Design a protein around this nucleic acid. Structure first.
Length: 111
RNA sequence: AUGUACGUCGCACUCAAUAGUCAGUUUUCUGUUUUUUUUUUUUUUUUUUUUUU
């Protein structure tokens, strides 16, 4: 979460980095944990920073792809759109310009 | 050639003052100046548990 020390985990569940961790003082932007435990609040014990590019190719069966703003572009002669990928609803990529025409063949042929 | 004609008159300014109508229960708030600044960015906080060629 932006400028807030709670961590929007998978689904709507929220937890935090354990105070005994070495990186408890610096919570990174993308951190993963080994054990989830229920206590006075939810926490993650063994925390570590990852790059958000790593998760997507290993989660091909888990990504929910989303396509918005279908607009045709002259620069490539095809339909462009901003793509959004989600694992359990988690925005791995908030926005990415993608070629909408290369994805589906039906409607863009008439376009 | 002679004789032959003359006389009186009027005008102006004005103009005040008048009818009748008695009375209205007791008490009350409303009221003044003064310091003026209305607002100054924030943080990471805890632990049932236990076994594997």
């Amino acid at each position: 979460d932006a400028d807030k020390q709670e961590y929007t985990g998978a689904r709507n569940a929220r937890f935090s980095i354990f105070p005994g961790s070495g990186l408890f003082k610096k919570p990174p932007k993308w951190v993963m944990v080994a054990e989830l435990v229920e206590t006075s609040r939810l926490w993650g014990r063994i925390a570590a920073r990852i790059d958000p590019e790593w998760v997507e190719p290993v989660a091909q069966h888990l990504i929910k792809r989303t396509y918005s703003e279908p607009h045709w572009e002259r620069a490539q002669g095809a339909v462009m759109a901003t793509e959004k990928v989600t694992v359990y609803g988690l925005p791995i990529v908030a926005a990415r310009k993608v070629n909408y025409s290369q994805i589906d063949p039906a409607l863009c042929r008439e376009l």
